[PDB]
Design a protein around this ligand. Structure first.
Ligand SMILES: Nc1nc2c(ncn2[C@@H]2O[C@H](COP(=O)(O)OP(=O)(O)OP(=O)(O)O)[C@@H](O)[C@H]2O)c(=O)[nH]1
Ligand SMILES: [Mg+2]
Length: 167
């Protein structure tokens, strides 16, 4: 069975590692800010090699090179962090416009839906400008609201990625 590299990117503290811990242990374990790459190999009947990249500012510049070979991209966002939503939109578009990954399906994980003031799926599409097809081309995209600490929507997020790789 073929291995498919999945890249997990997003700003620091978005909940990337929290999501990957749930995908494996089904539990909320303590996390440390990822300053490197934490690679987990999961099987959901296709095995994928998920690369949880670090989201700290001075590490984001490495995403372009570290994602080499990814078949799908998961961009995790902190839905409750309205003060850093312009910063996440800027990073999401840097990935979308990266000429190295133009055909890769993009799953946008709207994490932290439990927090008060969390943005809705509609609100995220509007702020991120994803309602403009011109700069999106023939790329398949999907938004999945999650609470990574409880795993709410996390199995449904990985099912979309798996469905995309099956194609
Ligand atoms: N309330 C709430 N907290 C969450 C959620 N997901 C993650 N967190 C918390 O958010 C913080 C950051 O989570 P991490 O998984 O370490 O974030 P990260 O994306 O890996 O960050 P970097 O490693 O620095 O890129 C932790 O305190 C988590 O427990 C969620 O859905 N709801
Ligand atoms: Mg991390």
């Amino acid at each position: 069975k073929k291995q498919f590299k999945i890249a997990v990117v997003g700003l620091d503290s978005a909940g990337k590692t929290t999501m990957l811990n749930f995908l494996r242990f089904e539990k909320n374990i303590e996390t440390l800010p990822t300053i490197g790459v934490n690679v987990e190999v999961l099987k959901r009947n296709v095995n994928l090699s998920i690369f949880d990249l670090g989201g700290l500012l001075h590490f984001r510049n490495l995403w372009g090179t570290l994602m080499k070979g990814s078949s799908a991209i998961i961009f995790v966002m902190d839905s409750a962090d309205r003060y850093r939503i312009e910063e996440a939109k800027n990073e999401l578009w840097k990935v979308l416009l990266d000429p190295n990954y133009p055909d890769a399906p993009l799953l946008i994980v709207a994490n932290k839906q439990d927090k008060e003031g969390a943005m809705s799926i509609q609100e995220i599409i509007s702020v991120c400008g994803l309602d403009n097809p011109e700069k999106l081309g023939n790329r398949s995209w999907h938004i999945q609201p999650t609470v990574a600490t409880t795993g709410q929507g996390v199995e449904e997020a990985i099912k979309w990625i798996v469905m995309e790789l099956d194609k």
